Amino acid sequence: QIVLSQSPAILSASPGEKVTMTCRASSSVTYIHWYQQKPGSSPKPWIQATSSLASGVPARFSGSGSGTSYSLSISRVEAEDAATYYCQQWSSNPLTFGAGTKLELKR
Amino acid sequence: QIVLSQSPAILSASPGEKVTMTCRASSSVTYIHWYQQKPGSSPKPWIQATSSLASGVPARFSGSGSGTSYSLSISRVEAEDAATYYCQQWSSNPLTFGAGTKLELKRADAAPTVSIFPPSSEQLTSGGASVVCFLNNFYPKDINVKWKIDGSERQNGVLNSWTDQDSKDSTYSMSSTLTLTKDEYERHNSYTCEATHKTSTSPIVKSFNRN
Amino acid sequence: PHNILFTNLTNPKTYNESNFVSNVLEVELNDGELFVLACELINKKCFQNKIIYHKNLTIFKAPFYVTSKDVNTECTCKFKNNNYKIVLKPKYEKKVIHGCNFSSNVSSKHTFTDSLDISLVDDSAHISCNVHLSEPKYNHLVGLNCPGDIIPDCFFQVYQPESEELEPSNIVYLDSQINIGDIEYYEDAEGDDKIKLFGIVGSIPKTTSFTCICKKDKKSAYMTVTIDSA
Amino acid sequence: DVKLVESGGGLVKLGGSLKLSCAASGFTFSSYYMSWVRQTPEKRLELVAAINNNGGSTYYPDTVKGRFTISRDNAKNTLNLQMNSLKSEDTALYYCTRQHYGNLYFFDYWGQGTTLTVSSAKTTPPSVYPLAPGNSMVTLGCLVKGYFPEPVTVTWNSGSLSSGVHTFPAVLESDLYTLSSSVTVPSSPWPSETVTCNVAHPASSTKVDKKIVPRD
Amino acid sequence: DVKLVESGGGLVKLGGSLKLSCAASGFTFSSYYMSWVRQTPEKRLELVAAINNNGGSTYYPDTVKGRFTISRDNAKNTLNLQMNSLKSEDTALYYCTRQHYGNLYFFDYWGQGTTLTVSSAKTTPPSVYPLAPSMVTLGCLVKGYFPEPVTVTWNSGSLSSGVHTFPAVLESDLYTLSSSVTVPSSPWPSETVTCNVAHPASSTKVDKKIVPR
Ligand SMILES: *[C@@H]1O[C@H](CO)[C@@H](O)[C@H](O)[C@H]1NC(C)=O
Ligand SMILES: *[C@@H]1O[C@H](CO)[C@@H](O)[C@H](O)[C@H]1NC(C)=O
């Protein structure tokens, strides 16, 4: 199977900061889906096909990568972005998810 | 002189929509500057040299065009983008601006928080008598106001003022004031402020009686 | 016919399968040279720039600037059930770029005559960096290395020079501005730094000048170029 | 940082003359093209006059050519615009804005503007009337009536009361302005704490503070 | 609106078997790939099983291959997962999610999940202990219960601000948690403060009034 490594585990940031998480795959993968999960709810589709943004996802979000290196970037972090973010691959059976980078705030 | 035509005059859009305004020039121009103006403040530099973004302008904004057709585009409209946008040229003397494109942003259908006020006893002693009627934080902008003195309308002496869209909550607010002579004010009892808004089939009225 | 390298592998200096070494053909294309090959390309595509693929024939023009001596465009032919490889790369000359490097990284692949670290300049400022060229004939590279936005699209479009009187300066196409023909253009990117330049060969009708603007965050700069003749 | 402060605006009678000045700070004034740009009541931006960095050459659109005159004192970091033979059409808010050849003549800094009114109507002071009635929150008001001309400033509790405040624009009644400002506070401070609107009318040199009390 | 409703989850003893069903509404169920995906206590997401639009072909990762069995009734708009020989590792919250070849197999819709617990421990009721000694901080210790959940409220829910209900933890095989409420010195002990602990699995409700020591 393909191991998806998400770093950092905890991504603490202050509002306005440009932040970026990283999804490193064991082998090469052609795409990475991104899902945002806030406590009390199931995951939500966030970034489709590596770079396309799901409906209602604000423009500050951005996806970029290829091969064994993908990323998700927030230009100006807003308070509402605090959540855990998971990357998903399915270039070969089985479909695997990532450990999840949790966006924490600072005060 | 180069005439800069901005269309549409009012651009209504819901948050997230991909919107684009258009700056049509009478003759060809080599570049178009863009400035954003929100009420209470002077214009702010927004897009430089047709496509370059001013410092701090969010990446969702974009500029493009050439010749007699230029544009400004927002990928995912945010509530804070509601403002008036002006395009500016200076390919030949004189430097001319555009009429502007005011950005309307769709919102939850809000009913106006109406409130009527009888004329102050201080104004009464001076011989005048103005009744004020506020209609705040409503959406859509479309609304109507009438004054019903003891049931009968009194459009004569009515002044109305409207604020542009609030950039925070995307709502609108309006003030109406029927002025009357102290004598005419005393000759009647009921003073009503009727308002017709999409939020209701029946008009939101607010009346006060001089007991 | 004086600047054509012709390699005949089908049915003005004519090379054939004798000049190959172990079925390899290393071709050093001078800046003022052309290469016309006649063969049946294996995958009909090639050149891992300005190339023309026409039927069983291919023609390639030498680029003015080359970054690494290893970069090369490689074609593979198949004639008489035999495979021949042709490696093409321009003569390696480390030409200097007559312009301003606004970036701060020093491990760049490009060398600029002038330089001005925009990161050091005051915010809300607009500092100039002038570059001048004064030769009868030219064979130079003029460009800039901006870490941020560049105004306008340089150097296909350029910004007119400043007017003494109160007249506006406009954006023009470089071809019209300097009034010469085959202006070669080249672009590059080192991290966030953008490297846009243009080449110039031959003389020039009239001494003319232009400007290109580079902004980064709240800081700004602009490079003014001036070339002369007659 | 950069800062441009217009001054000198007010009411001028038909055909009069007035000098507006602009103070500059926080940048090399001598290296930036300055320009006066106005805004009409119809909300239109128009270039009035412009000047180069060294003050040599100037331009004026034909609409105001010969009538107005721009000027700059680089030693004092000041920009002046002597407007003569003013017509009613010149009634506008005049901004002081800058440009630089090195930013493709971009207006990266404007001012707050100074308001010019060209009319023959007499300068009249305002008459502040309190708006109060006689149940979670409460909306209070402040009626400014019968003044001339704008500029006018309405604030609540000397500026501390900022949230929930709508200051509606002014309108001409017969030939005098009239406006109002709403303020919405909870019902807790309505009988307990004091709320005052601070109306100022510089043209008439008048400052009024009306504490909103219940109707008795 | 698209809707997916998981159901059937609960506590299963070691080696047992259980069927989970998912109700779909608001879209053409027959045109979408369905899949069961579970979330471990480590908060990791794992694909359990998937099925094609017509129900023909299916896939199961080797971890559960043969044990579990996915199925779909397109006439009833339902997705079923018969899980057999359940092990402790299968303890997870199971989501019912969809995909489409036309959206690059994107999970654009997920249900709220149904919680599966695979353990042999016996159902045990809780033992509420009060925690008593400016903003005075009071507590409520819930000890020795099984299984999860447990609802801790203060003053029947009215006391909501300044309340931290810490997560539960396995002691030996039973859970244990606590809830911290912080009120000023004035309302306590002058006015009463009570924690309401309920354990539906054991059909038990406890209300402990916090009194000074
Ligand atoms: C080119 O190749 C053809 C192969 O048939 C040969 O007949 C011809 O003589 C060649 N010409 C040269 C100049 O090598
Ligand atoms: C140039 O230097 C910067 C230093 O911040 C570095 O981030 C970048 O990777 C360097 N570029 C190359 C091509 O090494």
Rounded to the nearest angstrom, the distance between the alpha carbon of C206 and the centre of ligand 2 is: 40
Taking each continuous run of H as one helix and of E as one strand, the counts in chain C are 1, 19
Of D37, D56, D54, D15, give the one whose Cα is nearest residue D114.
Answer: D37
Rounded to the nearest angstrom, the distance between the alpha carbon of C23 and the centre of ligand 1 is: 18
Q: Do residues E109 and E9 share a domain?
A: yes
Of C177, C52, C197, C56, give the one whose Cα is nearest residue C131.
Answer: C197
Q: Do residues D170 and D108 share a domain?
A: no
Q: Do residues B130 and B45 share a domain?
A: no
H-assigned helices in chain D: 189-192
Give CA–CA dist E195/E181, Å, rounded.
Answer: 9
The shortest CB-CB distance from D95 to any of B42, B100, B132 is to B42
Phi, psi of B182 (to 5 degrees): -55, -40
Q: Do residues B77 and B117 share a domain?
A: no
Q: Do residues E113 and E139 share a domain?
A: no
Q: Which chains touch B (3 or more CB pairs under 8 A)?
A: A, C, D
List the determination method. Answer: X-ray
Question: Which of C8, C9, C20 is the best mutation target for the ligand 1 pocket, counting ligand atoms within 8 Å of the beta carbon and taking the most?
Answer: C8
Of E61, E206, E67, give the one whose Cα is nearest residue E143.
Answer: E206
**B152, β-bridge pairs:** B149
Locate tokens 């500092």: which residue? C127
Of C161, C183, C159, C181, give the one whose Cα is nearest residue C171.
Answer: C159
| DSSP per-residue codes, B19-34 | EEEEEEEEEEES--EE
Strands annotated E in chain A: 4-7, 10-12, 19-25, 33-37, 44-48, 52-53, 61-66, 69-74, 84-89, 96-97, 101-104
Residue E131 CB coordination number (10 Å): 16
Q: In angstroms, how far is CA E171 from the centroid of its own chain? A: 19
Structural domain containing residue B68: 4-105
Q: In angstroms, how far is CA D55 from the centroid of its own chain? A: 27
Q: Do residues E86 and E190 share a domain?
A: no
CA distances (Å), D10 to each of D80, D113, D116, D153, E200, in order?
Answer: 15, 12, 5, 14, 76
Phi, psi of C37 (to 5 degrees): -105, 145
Rounded to the nearest angstrom, the distance between the alpha carbon of C59 and the centre of ligand 1 is: 18
| DSSP per-residue codes, E141-155 | EEEEEBSS--EEEEG
Give CA–CA dist B14/B16, Å, rounded.
Answer: 6
Contact of C220 with chain D, judged by CB distance below 8 Å, is answered with: yes
Rounded to the nearest angstrom, the distance between the alpha carbon of C148 and the centre of ligand 2 is: 14
Q: Do residues E80 and E167 share a domain?
A: no
> What residue ranges line ligand 2, CB within 6 angstroms?
C 105, 107, 190-191
Burial class (CB in 10 A: 0-12, 13-18, 19+), B152: exposed
Q: Do residues E9 and E80 share a domain?
A: yes
Q: Do residues B85 and B128 share a domain?
A: no
Of B58, B76, B105, which marks where a domain is finished?
B105
Give CA–CA dist E5/E21, Å, rounded.
Answer: 8
> Is E111 in contact with A42 (Cβ distance < 8 A)?
yes
Q: Do residues E65 and E157 share a domain?
A: no
**D51, β-bridge pairs:** D34, D58
Residue C44 CB coordination number (10 Å): 10
Of E59, E91, E118, which marks where a domain is finished?
E118
Give CA–CA dist C181/C186, Å, rounded.
Answer: 16
CA distances (Å), C199 to each of A59, B173, C65, C221, in order?
Answer: 39, 60, 8, 22
Question: Which of C117, C190, C193, C195 is the best mutation target for the ligand 2 pocket, counting ligand atoms within 8 Å of the beta carbon and taking the most?
Answer: C190
Cβ B87 vs Cβ D184: under 8 Å:
no
Give CA–CA dist D178/D167, Å, rounded.
Answer: 12
> Is D178 in contact with B177 (Cβ distance < 8 A)?
yes
Q: Which of D103, D105, D109, D110 to mutate to test the interface with C (most CBs of C within 10 A)?
A: D103
CA distances (Å), B50 to each of B23, B32, B44, C133, E204, in order?
Answer: 11, 5, 15, 30, 70
Rounded to the nearest angstrom, the distance between the alpha carbon of C36 and the centre of ligand 1 is: 14
Of D100, D90, D124, give the one whose Cα is nearest residue D2.
Answer: D100
> Is B43 in contact with D43 (Cβ distance < 8 A)?
no
Residue C16 CA: nearest ligand 1 atom is: 14
Q: Do residues B51 and B93 share a domain?
A: yes
Rounded to the nearest angstrom, the distance between the alpha carbon of C22 and the centre of ligand 1 is: 21
Cβ B197 vs Cβ B205: under 8 Å:
no
Q: Do residues E96 and E142 share a domain?
A: no
> Is A58 in contact with B75 (Cβ distance < 8 A)?
no
Q: Do residues D146 and D167 share a domain?
A: yes
Structural domain containing residue E140: 127-210
Rounded to the nearest angstrom, the distance between the alpha carbon of C219 and the centre of ligand 2 is: 20
CA-nearest residue, atom 8 of ligand 1: C11
Cβ C58 vs Cβ C52: under 8 Å:
yes
Structure-token pair, residue E71: 């199925």
CA distances (Å), B189 to each of A74, B146, B156, in order?
Answer: 61, 17, 18
Give CA–CA dist C147/C217, Å, rounded.
Answer: 10
Strands E114-118 and E163-165: unpaired
CA-nearest residue, atom 14 of ligand 2: C107
Of E87, E118, E149, which marks where a domain is finished?
E118
Chain D hits for B121, CB-CB cut-off 8 Å, are: 215
Q: Do residues D113 and D20 share a domain?
A: yes
Give the CATH number of the domain where residue D111 resides. Answer: 2.60.40.10
Q: Which of 49-78 (E) contact A at CB < 8 A?
A: 50, 59, 61
> Is E44 in contact with A84 (Cβ distance < 8 A)?
no
> Is D57 in contact with C164 (Cβ distance < 8 A)?
yes
Q: Do residues B120 and B184 share a domain?
A: yes
CA distances (Å), E177 to each of C175, E167, E195, in order?
Answer: 77, 6, 13
Contact of D182 with chain B, judged by CB distance below 8 Å, is answered with: yes
Give CA–CA dist E98/B46, Å, rounded.
Answer: 42
Of E89, E118, E147, which marks where a domain is finished?
E118
Cβ D159 vs Cβ D118: under 8 Å:
no
Chain D hits for C160, CB-CB cut-off 8 Å, are: none
Q: Which of E6, E39, E45 to mutate to test the interface with A (most CBs of A within 10 A)?
A: E45
Quote the minimal CA–CA distance from E47 to chain A in Å: 7
Query: What ligand has the least distance to the C-alpha of C11?
Result: 1
Whether chains C and B touch (3+ CB pairs under 8 A) is answered by: yes
> Is D127 in contact with B43 (Cβ distance < 8 A)?
no
CA-nearest residue, atom 4 of ligand 1: C11
Quote the minimal CA–CA distance from B139 to chain A in Å: 22
Q: Do residues B77 and B94 share a domain?
A: yes
> Is D109 in contact with C124 (Cβ distance < 8 A)?
yes
Rounded to the nearest angstrom, the distance between the alpha carbon of C117 and the centre of ligand 2 is: 14
Give CA–CA dist B207/B150, Å, rounded.
Answer: 10
Q: Do residues B96 and B168 share a domain?
A: no
> Is D169 in contact with B163 (Cβ distance < 8 A)?
yes
Structure-token pair, residue A44: 């939500």
Give CA–CA dist E162/E182, Å, rounded.
Answer: 5
Rounded to the nearest angstrom, the distance between the alpha carbon of C89 and the centre of ligand 2 is: 27
Residue partners of E62: CB distance under 8 A and separation at least 6: none
Q: In angstroms, how far is CA C49 from the centroid of its own chain? A: 9
Q: For D145-170, b where at least 16 C-beta lie within 10 A, e where not — what string?
A: bbbbbbbbebbbbeeebeeebbbbeb
Number of domains in chain D: 2
| Number of residues in chain A | 107
Of E96, E92, E184, give the one whose Cα is nearest residue E134.
Answer: E184
Number of domains in chain B: 2
Locate tokens 């005051």: which residue? C122
Q: Which of C100, C126, C224 to mutate to test the interface with D (most CBs of D within 10 A)?
A: C126
Cβ B76 vs Cβ B60: under 8 Å:
yes
Of E89, E123, E147, E113, give the one whose Cα is nearest residue E36.
Answer: E113
Residue partners of E104: CB distance under 8 A and separation at least 6: A31, A33, A48, A49
Contact of E149 with chain A, judged by CB distance below 8 Å, is answered with: no
Q: Do residues D32 and D135 share a domain?
A: no
**What Rg do the C-alpha atoms of chain C give, in angstroms?**
21
Give CA–CA dist E148/E115, Å, rounded.
Answer: 10
Rounded-to-10 torsion of CA C5, C6, C12, C14: 110
Please tell me the number of Cα atoms within 13 Å of D68 on its side-chain side: 27
Cβ D170 vs Cβ D177: under 8 Å:
yes
Q: Which chains touch E (3 or more CB pairs under 8 A)?
A: A
CA-nearest residue, atom 13 of ligand 2: C190
Please tell me what resolution, in angstroms, this structure has: 3.7
Residue partners of A64: CB distance under 8 A and separation at least 6: A50, A51, A70, A71, A73
Give the CATH number of the domain where residue A9 resides. Answer: 2.60.40.10
The shortest CB-CB distance from A42 to any of E47, E95, E105 is to E95
Give CA–CA dist B182/B123, Å, rounded.
Answer: 9
State which amino acid sits at residue D24. Answer: A
The shortest CB-CB distance from E106 to any of A45, A86, A99 is to A45
Chain E hits for A89, CB-CB cut-off 8 Å, are: none
Q: Do residues D132 and D208 share a domain?
A: yes
CA-nearest residue, atom 1 of ligand 2: C105
Chain B hits for C167, CB-CB cut-off 8 Å, are: 93
Q: Do residues B146 and B203 share a domain?
A: yes
Q: Do residues B101 and B9 share a domain?
A: yes
C161: enclosing H helix or E strand? none
Query: What ligand has the least distance to the C-alpha of C107?
Result: 2
Q: 3-class SS at C177?
A: helix
Residue partners of A30: CB distance under 8 A and separation at least 6: A91
| D214 prior amide bond cis, ω within 30 | no
The shortest CB-CB distance from B130 to any of D95, D145, D166 is to D145
| DSSP per-residue codes, A7-27 | E-SEEE--TT--EEEEEEESS
